[PDB]
Every structure is written in C-alpha cells, then in structure tokens.
From Swiss-Prot, chain A:
Function: Involved in the biosynthesis of polyamines which are thought to support the growth of thermophilic microorganisms under high-temperature conditions. It seems that long-chain and branched-chain of polyamines effectively stabilize DNA and RNA, respectively. Catalyzes the irreversible transfer of a propylamine group from the amino donor S-adenosylmethioninamine (decarboxy-AdoMet) to various amine acceptors such as agmatine, cadaverine (1,5-diaminopentane), putrescine (1,4-diaminobutane) and 1,3-diaminopropane.
UniProt-recorded name of the protein: Polyamine aminopropyltransferase
Signal sequence residues: none
Cytoplasm listed as a keyword: yes
Binding of spermidine, residues: H59, D83, D156, S157, T158, D159
Organism: Pyrococcus furiosus (strain ATCC 43587 / DSM 3638 / JCM 8422 / Vc1)
Source organism superkingdom: Archaea
Catalytic reaction equation(s): cadaverine + S-adenosyl 3-(methylsulfanyl)propylamine = aminopropylcadaverine + S-methyl-5'-thioadenosine + H(+); S-adenosyl 3-(methylsulfanyl)propylamine + agmatine = N(1)-(3-aminopropyl)agmatine + S-methyl-5'-thioadenosine + H(+); S-adenosyl 3-(methylsulfanyl)propylamine + putrescine = S-methyl-5'-thioadenosine + spermidine + H(+); S-adenosyl 3-(methylsulfanyl)propylamine + propane-1,3-diamine = norspermidine + S-methyl-5'-thioadenosine + H(+)
The gene coding this protein: speE
UniProtKB/Swiss-Prot annotation, chain B:
Descriptive protein name: Polyamine aminopropyltransferase
Pathway(s) served: Amine and polyamine biosynthesis; spermidine biosynthesis; spermidine from putrescine: step 1/1
Annotated spermidine binding sites: H59, D83, D154, S155, T156, D157
Cytoplasm among keywords: yes
Keywords: Cytoplasm, Polyamine biosynthesis, Spermidine biosynthesis, Transferase
Domain spans labelled PABS: 3-228
InterPro entries according to UniProt: PABS (IPR030374), PABS_CS (IPR030373), SAM-dependent_MTases_sf (IPR029063), Spermi_synthase (IPR001045), Spermidine_synt_N (IPR035246), Spermidine_synt_N_sf (IPR037163)
SUPFAM superfamilies per the UniProt record, alphabetical: S-adenosyl-L-methionine-dependent methyltransferases
Function of the molecule: Involved in the biosynthesis of polyamines which are thought to support the growth of thermophilic microorganisms under high-temperature conditions. It seems that long-chain and branched-chain of polyamines effectively stabilize DNA and RNA, respectively. Catalyzes the irreversible transfer of a propylamine group from the amino donor S-adenosylmethioninamine (decarboxy-AdoMet) to various amine acceptors such as agmatine, cadaverine (1,5-diaminopentane), putrescine (1,4-diaminobutane) and 1,3-diaminopropane.
Source organism (scientific name): Pyrococcus furiosus (strain ATCC 43587 / DSM 3638 / JCM 8422 / Vc1)
Catalysed conversion reaction: cadaverine + S-adenosyl 3-(methylsulfanyl)propylamine = aminopropylcadaverine + S-methyl-5'-thioadenosine + H(+); S-adenosyl 3-(methylsulfanyl)propylamine + agmatine = N(1)-(3-aminopropyl)agmatine + S-methyl-5'-thioadenosine + H(+); S-adenosyl 3-(methylsulfanyl)propylamine + putrescine = S-methyl-5'-thioadenosine + spermidine + H(+); S-adenosyl 3-(methylsulfanyl)propylamine + propane-1,3-diamine = norspermidine + S-methyl-5'-thioadenosine + H(+)
Family of the protein in this entry: Belongs to the spermidine/spermine synthase family.
Assembly information from the UniProt record: Homodimer.
Length: 271, 269
C-alpha cells in the first residue's frame, strides 16, 4: 500500500501492485506506482499529484470554471502542470495560445514516459511542434514578473511563494481586463490555515475573490480552489453554450452553483 | 494505523495511539480506537461510524436539511443512531417527540461510556428521563408505528434500502412528510447509491440526492431524500436555520448541498 499522511494523522491510501519508478530530481523526489484499482499514481515528495483513473476530478474543476466564466479566454498561462492534464483541459477551449511554465523538467519527462495522461501533448511542447501550447522550463514566480498579458492564469503547482501577496500583485498586473486567476489551494479540512492565509492575501489584490471546493480523487477530500478576478467577471455565472461542447465527467457546469460547496465554519472565517 | 478499505483498493486511514475496546455483540464487532489527531474512532465490522473530532460533518448534513425543508417537523423517527449524534441534532429544533430505534444496545453502552458525543442524552434516554427523546431497542424495518413528520435512517451501508421498506416508510409518514438516509460513498459505492435511488423513485412523490464531505468516511458521502406531499427539498426555512448552531452544513448556501460529480448526476436521471 501507498499512503500519503496529512496533518493530524489522516491518510489517503491506495492498494498498490508495484512501485515502478523513483528519482530524486533537482527539486523533489519523484515516484510512480501502479495501483490496484486507480491506474498509475504520480507522487512528489510522497504527496499524490494524480491517479490516472480519476485525475479528471482535479483537472476539470481547476480549469473549466475559470475558462467558462471568462467572456473570451484566448491567452492562458499555466504555472506547474508538469503532468500535462491542465494544459489538456485548457485546449478543450478555442484559445490562441497556452504557455506552460514548469520548474522541474524531470516531472515532465517522467509524466510523458510513465503517466501519459497528456496524450502526446508534452512531447509536442518539448519539440516545439504544438500549434497553441508552448513550454518554458523555469520558475513561475520569476516568469510572471517578466511576462504578461493573459486572460486566464492557472496555478497548478505543488503544496506551498506562489501563495504570497507579492506574487498575487504580479499576477494581477499580468492579467488582462477582464482576467481570472485560479489556484488549487489545499485540503479544505487539513490545510485550512494555508487556505485562509492565501485567501487573505488575494483579497488585498484582486477586484473579486471566490473560493470553491471539489471532491478530488487521490487527495484528502475535498480540495479547495481560490479565484482572483481582475475587472468585471461574475464567477457564479458560466457560458452554458460553451459548457455543453466540453467533454466532462466530474465538473458539472449545468449545476455550477453547486461548485461553491464549503463547510460553514470555513465560509464564515473567509467572509 | 487504522484503515478502512473500500472497493478498488481505496483506503481511509488514521494514525492511532491504541485500540481501547473490542466486543462481539449479538449483531456485530464493536471496536473503539484512540486516534492521534481525530479523537476516538468507533467502528462496526471494521467500518468507521464516526471520529469524535469531525462527526458533525456527518450528523449535520444528515439531519438539518430535511428538518428545515419540512414546514413543521414535530414528530421525528431516527432508525439506528446508537452514538446519539443524530438525535442530538434533531433536538436543536423545537420538536415535540423524537423516537430512536437502535437494534444493538451494546453500541449505545459503548458510545455513552467511551465516545460521549451525546452530552448526557444517551443516559437520559436509557432511564426514560428525557422529556422529548425516547429510546427503543429493535429493528427499524420491524418498527407497527406510524405518524412521523421526519424519518431519518442513520444506519449501516447498502433491508433498509429495499422497495418493501420504502413503502412502509411512506405509509408511516404524515402529509407533508420527509425521509432521509445516508446512501454510501459517492465514488466507491456508486451502483448501490443508484439502485437505492431507483427503489425510492418507485415509492415517493419526489426523490432528491445530495453529497457532503464527511470526515472519517470515503469522501464525499451520498444522501437520499424521499418526500410525501408538498415539500420542495431545494428550499429551506432560512429563519429557523439562523438559530441553529452549525459548523459544517451551511443552510444559507443550501443550493450547494446538491454537489455531485457530473457522470453520477447523469446516471441518476
């Protein structure tokens, strides 16, 4: 069995068939497992990044709400996303360009070789042959200081500078108007202090801030997401006609109002 | 560590200090563990019933949506609920009577001694001293008795999910009335959730489904609601809701109660 242990001794466990890879990269320990019932598991420093049977429960709620809330998202930035799932979801939409900035090249290599949820996308980006998606190997924090003009910015990073006020100010400045930033923001129940502090810093910067939660398979459930808006976007509304064209199994745009489920004590603290 | 394993090799795990209790009753194996960070854990046949630090994440969404959806819930039945959490939540509301029917008396005894989420309620009920709450020992299916505004099934996972049972429940409900049951893991007991929804659709005037992040269970957890007469379960009494002390269920955001993965919603329709 593989177990990820969280604060206070809560654990997410998977029966495993085999450990099939391990490498200490320049930034983290990368490990891949074949699980019994959830396909392959990618772990970074012993934390679950995804399971191949269930990962859409993360990548769909991370990407599509923000993409559908924006009136016409054409230029998108993804920070992290070494496994390729996030950029794959972004490309369901008719964007002009998606830039991905990932610090750890070895996560990309391990994912394209052993995980393969990206369906050839990572290889195309590494070879510079993709018509819309471009890859930069680097620090998203530095990148956003020096690069700008995005309709949507998606932080698909590991657990927590990407949650600092300094970073959010650079993000806001780099966003178009209208613009939307979204980040995974940790376990609702177990990383609660980290969620609240991130929300606090975002509220200083953005014109609107929203929170939501979703049942992500492989993570301590449910997982939190935070949204920062530049300009006039009502994140409680989505483009239903664009939504109908998407291939979705987890996020339910026709029931978009339900996205905002959150335990009461956390709702109160954030407000 | 304690682990409860679910279908497809998914596991909910708690680091534990010690196992402090184990007894085979006439019905099941009752165990109590001391966890490192979630208080005490009560298990029946290796399945988590509750952890004391977090159990309100189950008992609140089980009880309060149905109690607030009903226009005037005065008489309530709870099937199961040996730990006392469910009846405690029902008593937040101004009910006349709440009857609790639990088959296994040993769960009540272990809960009142070792778990203590009930704040003296179980003791009061055992001695017939509580003015509103009455305890009876027996099978909920067998339990004859009718005239309830709200019936809550706080029992084990998918006899209590059969069409035959649901007809007796429907006949036992007032008009207006409302039934609610916990309905298993959304992701891992999905076929069982769908088949319970199907049986309820054959009997009740309207069936609703929702989910909630319950601490200690494979999350999220499903709940099913059957309605007799004129109750719109998408609406709740906001003014009564503001007087409850709640940490988890958020009645002012009642519309979000109905979160459910898209593929599961589509299958249910």
């Amino acid at each position: 069995a593989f177990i990820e242990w969280y604060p206070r001794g809560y654990g997410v466990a998977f029966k495993i068939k085999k450990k099939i890879y391990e490498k200490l990269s320049k930034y983290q320990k990368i490990e891949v497992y074949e699980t019994e019932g959830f396909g392959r598991l990618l772990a970074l420093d012993g934390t679950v990044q995804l399971v191949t049977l269930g990962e859409r429960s993360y990548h769909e709620p991370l990407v599509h709400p923000a993409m559908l809330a924006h009136p016409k998202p054409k230029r998108v930035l993804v920070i992290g996303g070494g496994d390729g799932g996030t950029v794959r979801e972004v490309l369901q939409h008719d964007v002009d360009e998606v830039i991905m900035v990932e610090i750890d090249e070895d996560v990309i290599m391990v994912s394209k070789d052993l995980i393969k949820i990206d369906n050839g996308l990572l290889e195309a980006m590494l070879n510079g042959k993709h018509e819309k998606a471009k890859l930069t190997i680097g620090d998203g924090f530095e990148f956003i200081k020096n690069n700008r003009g995005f309709d949507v910015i998606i932080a698909d990073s590991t657990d927590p500078v990407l949650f600092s006020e300094e970073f959010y100010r650079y993000v806001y400045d780099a966003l178009n108007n209208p613009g939307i930033y979204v980040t995974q923001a940790g376990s609702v129940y177990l990383f609660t202090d980290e969620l609240i502090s991130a929300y606090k810093e975002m509220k200083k910067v953005f014109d609107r801030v929203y929170y939501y939660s979703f049942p992500v398979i492989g993570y301590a459930s449910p997982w939190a997401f935070l949204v920062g808006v530049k300009g006039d976007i009502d994140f409680t509304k989505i483009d239903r006609e664009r939504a109908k064209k998407l291939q979705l199994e987890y996020y339910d745009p026709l029931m978009h109002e339900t996205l905002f489920q959150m335990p009461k004590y956390i709702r109160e603290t954030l407000q």
